Structure formats: C-alpha cells, structure tokens
C-alpha cells in the first residue's frame, strides 16, 4: 500500500526530478493527500485540500474570488505554478477542482534545483497534482453534491483495464455543478471532463492525461481598499457581497500531457514528458472598491479584462544508479522547456462607466448600476520562455542510513511584450542545492537542506541611471533543519527554516549620473518553526494538523522606510486541528469530524499602521458509510465556518475581502 494509517495521507511523494521518495527518506517537509481525503472534505478546490489542516499554509479564505489564493511558509504560491504529474504549465490557470486527482502533494519551501522555475516565479512551495489511473478492478462511482444555498452537482468516475495482462488502462471523470452559493447574489458553475490513459509494458511505460474545465462565478469577489486616514471599518455580516452583483468571471482551461519511460537496464532509465494547455479568462466587474468613509461608504471603479494564453511544456532526462566502494549513487540529469503566448484585452477605463459606483458596505439593497457590455479591446501580445538543465546525485553511506543529495540547475528566462520599446534578452542563473538526511533509527530521520527559488528579473525603467537593464533571475534562499518521527500509525514533523527573498526597486538615494538607480537590494526574510502531525494516534481516531510560528520581516526596503516591519497579509501564529472519530452503528460506520483553524493578526500595509485581528474558525462533519444490497454507499454532511464569523483578510491586488460565510455541504456517493 502507498497510504498511511487512516487512508487520508500517502507515505511518499514526488520530489521534483529526484522522483518518488518515502516520508522518512525525504529531506524536505512534504505531505501528500489522497483522493479519499478530498472526497471526505467535499473539497471544491485545491485550497480546501491543502489549507485545512496545514499550519504552514494560509489563505484569506474568500468565497468566489477570481482565483485561489494561498501562501506557503509565508510567501505567495501562485496557482500558475502547480505541476501535474511533475510537469508545469498544464493545470488550470487560476482555480482547479480536484476530482481528477489521486493525490495532492505539497512540498514546502522553494525548489528550483528540483523543479526548475515555474511560470510565475513564486517560491513558497510546490503543489503537485497526481492524476488518477485505472485500478485493476473495474470501477464506477456516481456522486450527487449540494452546497448552500442552491448549488447542485454531480461527479461520475469510471475505470477499467484492457488486454490479456491488464496492461492498458482507461479512467474517466466527469463533473458538473451549478447554482447560488453561500454569499448573497453569487453563483458558481464548474465543469470538468478528464481522461487518464496508461500502458504498462515490460521495459516501458506510457501515461496520457487530458482534461477540459470550466470555472464561472457570477457575483465574483474582488475586495476593497482602505487608507490610514479613513480606517478599516467593522466587517459586515459574512454573506455580504462587496463587489457588483452583475460582475462575473469565467476561465476555460484545456490541457493534455504524455509521459514515457524506458528501462535500458535496472541501472539506467530514460524519461520524457510533453504537454500543452490553453487558458481563456474573462472578467467584467469592479477593478477595486475603496472605502472612503468610516460610515462604510464604498467607491468601486469598473474594469474589464480578457486574456488567452497557449502554453507548451517539456521535461526529458536520464536516471541511474551505481556503486563505488561502499557508496551508492542515484543520479539524474534533465532538461526542461516552457513557452507561452498570450493576448491581453483590457479597459482600464470603460467608456460610459468611468465614474465609480457609490454604495455603502452595510447596505442591504445596494444599487450597482447597469452591467456594461463586455467589449475589451486588444492591448498587447506577450511571451514567456524558460529552459533549464539540471544534474543531481544522491549518495548513500552506511546501508542507506546517511543520504547526501547534491545538485545544480542552469535556468534561462526571456519575456517579450509587443508594447515594450525597451530591450528584450534572455537571462540566466545557476542554482545549487544540497540536502542531508540521517536515519537515527528506522522510525526517526533528521535532515537539513539548502535550496533556492527563482523569479524572473525585473527591468529598470527609462527614468533610471541604468535604464533598461534586465536583472538575472533572482534567488530566494532557504536553510532548513528538521526532524521526522513515524511511530507506526501516527507521525510527527518538526522543522525550522529561514528563507530570504529579494525584491527590486527604483532607489532615489543612490544617484548615478544624478539619476535614481534600479537595484535588487530589497529583502524579506521569513523565519519559522513548524510542528505538524498526521495519522491515527488511537484506534478509531484520526488526527491531523499542527502549530507554526512565523517571523516574516522586511529587512531591506526602499529608503529604509519600512525596515524591520512585518510583511503584509500573513499571520505570525497558526494552529490547526482536524479530528475524526469512528463508531459502529447498525450496518455501517459513522464518522464524526471537527476542525479548528486559529490564526493571529495580519498587517494590511507594509508601514504596519493598519491591521486586522486574528480569528478562529470551526467546521464540523458527519459521514456514514454502508452497503445497500452490497454496493458501497457514503453519505456526507459538512458545515464550514460554523459560527458564521465575519472577518476581513487580505487577497491579491486589493487590501481586504470578506472570508467565506457559513456553508453547508451534502453529498451521496454510490459504487456500481
């Protein structure tokens, strides 16, 4: 079995191009969630999977935003930067419904050695989505879903293997759901069709995945801005929508990939992966609300955006083992390629609709005005290309009890834009990694790593002493020290880390030829301690979660103005706890569940003069699983934000947004 006691977490995960590694063999803080856990949470997106019990992950928790939004180790981790089966550029751009995945894997911290630079250059962590393939036994499950107030849905999952040796597999997933959600005047529509094909040969293997997805929100949440002069007013009740009720966002995503492996011997393997995807995004609504008085007056400017992006992606390489003296080597060498082309259509100012719409956030009957026709004109075409070449070796001493991993990767990046007159060139950087793992016993591992993340370099403006200079890719740097303990059915991780991340800015205090200079002297430093755990500490009980302390400090900022201040948006303290308790009832198993998610305050600006308080959220759940004439049936009921706590937290692009209100979810599932 791959799965740990309880069924919710897997025992191994993909560690970029080092491939599959077990929990106690992995000198990084990783976790992998099963499809069972996904169905048990009734998760509708990736955030609801990876944020529920992990204290190193934070979301502002808004309902029906234009994308998912989460941080890992106190840094942004962009939805653009998820991998599928280890390959970037395939998954949906902004929001991914998790019906098509057998695992959701999280690797905490930056990982450029392992993965290369993902398209948006975030460095918080890597989320890897592993698709489903057909199990040996024919399989068909139908599930009907409900989410308050009036969203109804279904999901069908069928699988079957063919050939004399079941060497071919086919796995199909289909999902649709539609209707009013828990926020007033907001509705959500989701559609997925997916396909997982595989062929197992004697010396060779091929895996194909393709999918078609739709995500649509009417009454999309955009959030709102505040100033120090006016203040942050008390949050309205939690089901309030503070963006136009006619506003909407729609993302269509299509993707396909193929992987191939060829075993030359038991010591040498080649592999290749190729994929492509398409994203069509449209948005019509507020570009931002602004709170203009302490009585709750709100001023919302309107904007429109569409973009189309075509992506291509590849990763090919060789893996091998050999021995020298009493040292075992496991090596890999790979090359990656990513390219996208993009068209952007946009109104900054919409004709007829440049006067902002004036409301009050506490109003039960806001007048949002008419809905402008959607006609954004073409603005610019843009491209992004990346490529990389990586080498690594894992050396093992003393019967596999000491493992030293060394490697490096060369990374190249180039961006173009059809409205940029400044020069456009590729830039490169070399990023090393080293990680040490010691097995004290066969139940206890201690580990340390140094590893980097990469972000494309900014370009100096025409106003600067160094006008049009393009910086090389910028290096985020992690040191980590950790301890892992597997007691058998229950496991612990304790880790400490320090991660520095640079930023770049125009600096009026460093004059060259009497002009401001563009520099990469900016720095944020996140130090943290994480204690987390999972599994079944007693019979019939499951328990997952942990506690983190995080110190996310702006150590160097423009002019020194904000030196020593705390980073925006993320909390310093998190405690999360998910529990499940099983009990035999009639002809089936009843499970009760509860979650608590407690966080401390967050700063809203880098001056640290505005903040929002901490908050504690509770969720409860019941689940009944039985057979009806010998067919497995599972009934599920959940309530999220049970106390209907109203809270502000920080999303992308704007200062504040309301967290999701109390939400009920029901589902029933039936195996044929």
Numbering used by the authors: 32 to 703
Task: List passages from the publication reporting this PDB structure.
The A. baumannii outer-membrane transporter protein, BauA, that recognises this siderophore has itself been identified as a vaccine candidate.
Residues 33 to 703 of the protein are well defined in the electron density map, while the N-terminal region comprising the TonB box is missing, presumably because it is flexible. Biophysical methods (gel filtration and light scattering) do not support a trimeric assembly.
